[PDB]
Write a protein that binds this ligand. Structure first.
Ligand code: WN1
Ligand code: ZN
Ligand code: ZN
Ligand code: ZN
Length: 461
């Protein structure tokens, strides 16, 4: 059971208003045939247009919500809506486009999907809340067949051109008119009571219903993300490398060690309360400090209430006011004043961050992590942590060209003494690169208000 069997049953109740008289007993095989697609028995890597929930989750980067509202089906114009916010009107003669025939509409579909997905995925997964018109309109912009490779590269083919009789991936499809071998999943098959709006609105107040096809397409993908990443969490699903994942993760580790090592040196806290990942290790293993861990998995729904993290039932809680609290990606509602905090900004635009549910986002780097909406009020007791580099390693080169470094934020013995050595200048530039990478990925750093880098200079006495 790797793929979805075409002989699986498809509940057709959601399809009977657009398709009155639809048989109650229906397989994917018959539905695909009814949609105009002839599979001709093909063992070539594309066994079904429809996929399982498990396969949809593994391909979350490919998700595109799709809804079709029948404005007036071959007689009446259809409004095509995508979770990109695009609305295309197709005539058979929140970006709203005027009524145009299918031959030109299909060119716009290929362009939009290619520009949206070329850096995210090797495919498209149309996420539906199927009522009928969306499935029967697919034949107007979709071609299917054996799995293929791009005419210009080795990537999987996602588009086909009737003008050149050629196939292309999302990167080489300019001017192509057909979506080739797409995937699709119907959320309505998962067993919901009531319509799309009522189920979506139970978990999200950010997507309204301005009564356009894109509003439903956005709500559909959002409800799917809630089901697969908010109420259900699977951190064992490994995701491919599509960008700066490795550099970002390495930068996070370097920044964490730097900031924690410096706060401990500057304010000599006797104890550190490490609140977050149950699998975390000491980021500063040489520090004197009493290191105490508290397990709290990444919250995918709402940010943790600081009160419930301290909630100890019939026993006493550990004192948090003693020493410093470290919250490295531990999303809470309001941090204590004695904290070192790394909070992901869900609003960041990137290929790793996908739109999520109720203001939150789905950060996909090796694993998928739905993160609750970034809330500036969480940090009222803290200040933004300024960039600085700290080093107490000996001034020794060991060796890339060089230009003299002049920086007030290079906290080293050599800078104190009047001139940064080449080694600390190379390490400062590498650290600043890592720092910028982590900030640009969407992470924000916060610290207790008494934090002052001036206190680091006296560690060179
Ligand atoms: C010092 O900072 C923290 C941070 C987070 C949690 C605790 C704590 O003591 N929690 C606790 C204790 C006994 C039973 C259940 C619990 F959740 C202390
Ligand atoms: Zn290509
Ligand atoms: Zn939503
Ligand atoms: Zn130096």
């Amino acid at each position: 059971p790797t793929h979805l069997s075409v002989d699986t049953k498809f509940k057709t109740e959601g399809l009977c208003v657009d398709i009155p008289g639809i048989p109650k007993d229906m397989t994917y095989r018959r539905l695909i045939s009814m949609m105009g697609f002839k599979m001709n028995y093909q063992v070539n890597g594309y066994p079904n247009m429809f996929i399982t929930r498990e396969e949809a989750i593994r391909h979350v980067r490919a998700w595109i919500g799709f809804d079709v509202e029948g404005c007036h089906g071959t007689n009446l114009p259809l409004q095509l809506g995508f979770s990109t916010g695009v609305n295309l009107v197709a005539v058979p003669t929140p970006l709203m486009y005027k009524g145009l025939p299918w031959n030109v509409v299909r060119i716009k579909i290929v362009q939009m999907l290619s520009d949206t997905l070329k850096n995210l995925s090797d495919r498209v997964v149309f996420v539906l809340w199927a009522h009928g018109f969306e499935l029967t309109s697919m034949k107007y912009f979709v071609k299917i067949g054996p799995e293929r490779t791009c005419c210009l590269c080795d990537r999987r083919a996602t588009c086909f051109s009737t003008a050149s009789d050629t196939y292309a991936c999302w990167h080489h499809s300019i001017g192509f008119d057909y979506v080739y071998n797409p995937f699709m999943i119907d959320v309505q098959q998962w067993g919901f009571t009531g319509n799309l709006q009522s189920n979506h609105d139970l978990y999200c107040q950010v997507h309204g219903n301005a009564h356009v096809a894109s509003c439903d397409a956005i709500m559909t993908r959002c409800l799917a993300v809630h089901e697969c990443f908010v109420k259900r969490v699977d951190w064992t699903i490994e995701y491919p490398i599509i960008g700066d994942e490795l550099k970002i993760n390495a930068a996070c580790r370097k920044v964490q060690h730097m900031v924690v090592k410096a706060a401990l040196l500057a304010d000599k806290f006797p104890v550190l309360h490490d609140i977050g990942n149950p699998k975390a290790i000491k980021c500063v293993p040489q520090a004197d400090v009493e290191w105490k861990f508290y397990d709290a998995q990444p919250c995918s729904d709402k940010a943790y209430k600081i009160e419930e993290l301290f909630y100890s039932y019939a026993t006493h809680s550990d004192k948090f006011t003693d020493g410093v609290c470290l919250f490295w990606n531990c999303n809470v509602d309001r941090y204590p004043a004695n904290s070192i905090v790394c909070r992901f900004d869900t609003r960041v635009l990137s290929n790793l961050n996908l739109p999520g549910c109720d203001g939150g986002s789905l950060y996909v780097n090796k694993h998928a992590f739905h993160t609750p909406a970034f809330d500036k009020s969480a940090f009222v007791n803290l200040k933004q942590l300024p960039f600085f580099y700290y080093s107490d390693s000996p001034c020794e080169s060991h060796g890339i060209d060089y230009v003299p470094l002049k920086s007030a934020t290079c906290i080293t013995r050599c800078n104190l003494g009047g001139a940064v050595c080449r080694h600390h200048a190379n390490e400062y530039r590498l650290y600043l690169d890592a720092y910028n990478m982590m900030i640009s990925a969407g992470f924000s750093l916060w610290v207790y208000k008494q934090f002052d880098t001036y206190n680091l200079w006296n560690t060179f006495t």
